[PDB]
Design a protein around this ligand. Sequence first.
Ligand SMILES: *[C@@H]1O[C@H](CO[C@@H]2O[C@@H](C)[C@@H](O)[C@@H](O)[C@@H]2O)[C@@H](O[C@@H]2O[C@H](CO)[C@@H](O[C@@H]3O[C@H](CO[C@H]4O[C@H](CO)[C@@H](O)[C@H](O)[C@@H]4O)[C@@H](O)[C@H](O[C@H]4O[C@H](CO)[C@@H](O)[C@H](O)[C@@H]4O)[C@@H]3O)[C@H](O)[C@H]2NC(C)=O)[C@H](O[C@@H]2O[C@@H](C)[C@@H](O)[C@@H](O)[C@@H]2O)[C@H]1NC(C)=O
Ligand SMILES: *[C@@H]1O[C@H](CO[C@@H]2O[C@@H](C)[C@@H](O)[C@@H](O)[C@@H]2O)[C@@H](O[C@@H]2O[C@H](CO)[C@@H](O[C@@H]3O[C@H](CO)[C@@H](O)[C@H](O[C@H]4O[C@H](CO)[C@@H](O)[C@H](O)[C@@H]4O)[C@@H]3O)[C@H](O)[C@H]2NC(C)=O)[C@H](O)[C@H]1NC(C)=O
Ligand SMILES: *[C@@H]1O[C@H](CO[C@@H]2O[C@@H](C)[C@@H](O)[C@@H](O)[C@@H]2O)[C@@H](O[C@@H]2O[C@H](CO)[C@@H](O)[C@H](O)[C@H]2NC(C)=O)[C@H](O[C@@H]2O[C@@H](C)[C@@H](O)[C@@H](O)[C@@H]2O)[C@H]1NC(C)=O
Ligand code: CL
Ligand code: NA
Ligand code: NA
Lengths: 280, 98
Amino acid sequence: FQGPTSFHVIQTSSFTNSTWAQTQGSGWLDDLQIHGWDSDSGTAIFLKPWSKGNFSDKEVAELEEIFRVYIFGFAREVQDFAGDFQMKYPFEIQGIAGCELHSGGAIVSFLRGALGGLDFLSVKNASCVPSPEGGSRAQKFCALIIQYQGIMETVRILLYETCPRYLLGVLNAGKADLQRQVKPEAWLSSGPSPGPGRLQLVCHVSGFYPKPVWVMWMRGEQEQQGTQLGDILPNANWTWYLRATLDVADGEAAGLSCRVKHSSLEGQDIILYWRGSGLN
Amino acid sequence: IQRTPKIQVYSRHPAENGKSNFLNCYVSGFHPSDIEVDLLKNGERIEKVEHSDLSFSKDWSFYLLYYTEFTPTEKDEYACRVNHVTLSQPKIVKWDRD
Ligand SMILES: *[C@@H]1O[C@H](CO[C@@H]2O[C@@H](C)[C@@H](O)[C@@H](O)[C@@H]2O)[C@@H](O[C@@H]2O[C@H](CO)[C@@H](O[C@@H]3O[C@H](CO[C@H]4O[C@H](CO)[C@@H](O)[C@H](O)[C@@H]4O)[C@@H](O)[C@H](O[C@H]4O[C@H](CO)[C@@H](O)[C@H](O)[C@@H]4O)[C@@H]3O)[C@H](O)[C@H]2NC(C)=O)[C@H](O[C@@H]2O[C@@H](C)[C@@H](O)[C@@H](O)[C@@H]2O)[C@H]1NC(C)=O
Ligand SMILES: *[C@@H]1O[C@H](CO[C@@H]2O[C@@H](C)[C@@H](O)[C@@H](O)[C@@H]2O)[C@@H](O[C@@H]2O[C@H](CO)[C@@H](O[C@@H]3O[C@H](CO)[C@@H](O)[C@H](O[C@H]4O[C@H](CO)[C@@H](O)[C@H](O)[C@@H]4O)[C@@H]3O)[C@H](O)[C@H]2NC(C)=O)[C@H](O)[C@H]1NC(C)=O
Ligand SMILES: *[C@@H]1O[C@H](CO[C@@H]2O[C@@H](C)[C@@H](O)[C@@H](O)[C@@H]2O)[C@@H](O[C@@H]2O[C@H](CO)[C@@H](O)[C@H](O)[C@H]2NC(C)=O)[C@H](O[C@@H]2O[C@@H](C)[C@@H](O)[C@@H](O)[C@@H]2O)[C@H]1NC(C)=O
Ligand SMILES: [Cl-]
Ligand code: NA
Ligand code: NA
């Protein structure tokens, strides 16, 4: 099946001073957002009609309450221990946790934490593993948290028992959107001149879904190895944008074409031809 | 260490003068998360701009998508203006269809 194969939640907790901290959170299928977190209410925002997957409204409300208590408690405890952990304000903590479906069917869970934009800890085999970037502070944190009754256990349940069944249920519940096929459009333009006597040609590809796509500059059936793929960029409403560039000498741009392949085109590639002398 | 934002400005559809389109500004690679992003038309802030909820990549750098409807013309200029703790002044990146 196509589309996303993983689910995760993220946390960004920004500690401005010893009496002010705020958290942002959200839920995602790969890089498609399916949940928001509303700090006004301490409840989730369900961005798709299928965002609860196969979970009952009661189980969803229980999980929202776990996250509400966790968000409040996290800030409370970090502010209380900030002095002992020699924390200097402002600082920012990030967390990501979830699970993913692999080839062969296994579901693997993960939890990672960061401080100052650097890795701080991870959960491997239901244990807190300090990251070397986190130094003695991460060793101190892991020794402190694993003594917390309830937290370790709740994290274990959520990662290894709740997340896998949630993931399968939501990939199934959302399949009309997650496995839809949206066709790209493509166009050509100039790029910044790489230098004297040289041009850059740009092949733009936009509005496709799912994300896997193939774009190449061509001379007839010869693929130009100089083709440079840009990073995939997002559009609003779950489609993507990509630029494929080629740097050539002024007199070598004639004869070039851009070829686009995508799962939605049913084997009917898009071919665009570059014409020189301002003829597009 | 703090990381300054990368700023990429692009249209959803090919620019056609007088035809409605969408202007995107993708801001990425930055740390810490607090950031201000505006889309500009001829140097003026566009009032109705939408944006994504905060996310971050595997290396913990944050990213956001800002977008709005716009109708390109031959004369009008569009841009993305970003403010972040790593910048002493706002950084402006102009939209350029060419
Ligand atoms: C949300 O969906 C989850 C996934 O559902 C499946 O996939 C979706 C896409 C649809 O196709 C569904 O129709 C389909 O069910 C549900 O979780 C899954 O539930 C099933 C039970 O319905 C469960 O199957 C059982 O598995 C155990 C063995 O499990 C262990 O071993 C496997 C490897 O072999 C391992 O992967 C597991 O992690 C465990 O370690 C097996 O013993 C059971 O057998 C008994 O029941 C069957 C009939 O069901 C009977 O024939 C046997 O004779 C015997 O009595 C049974 O096969 C899946 O393992 C589970 N999947 C996961 C990843 O957890 C989910 O269901 C709820 O959670 C389940 C864990 C279970 O408690 C259910 O009763 C719950 O309803 C569903 N709902 C929610 C709210 O999560
Ligand atoms: C993968 O994980 C398993 C399971 O870990 C256990 O369950 C998780 C849910 C989580 O709660 C863990 O904290 C928990 O341990 C690992 O299997 C366990 O391995 C540990 C060693 O790391 C064993 O611990 C020993 O247990 C003895 C009692 O049965 C006890 O006498 C030992 O105490 C002595 O040593 C410890 C330091 O290791 C010291 O603190 C004590 O004071 C004392 O000197 C020790 O606690 C568990 O018995 C194992 N549990 C099971 C069920 O097998 C597994 O090793 C790990 N795999 C890898 C490769 O990391
Ligand atoms: C503790 O920090 C808060 C600072 O928060 C603002 O948002 C941060 C994310 C960051 O951008 C920071 O630069 C900002 O200042 C203060 O609260 C805010 O205070 C401002 C007044 O400067 C006010 O406009 C905001 O509404 C207020 N936000 C909230 C949610 O309270 C704290 O200030 C104290 O509390 C205020 C309510 C006010 O009474 C102020 O005079 C107090 O100092 C900061 N406290 C301390 C002790 O530094
Ligand atoms: Cl909240
Ligand atoms: Na050509
Ligand atoms: Na974002």
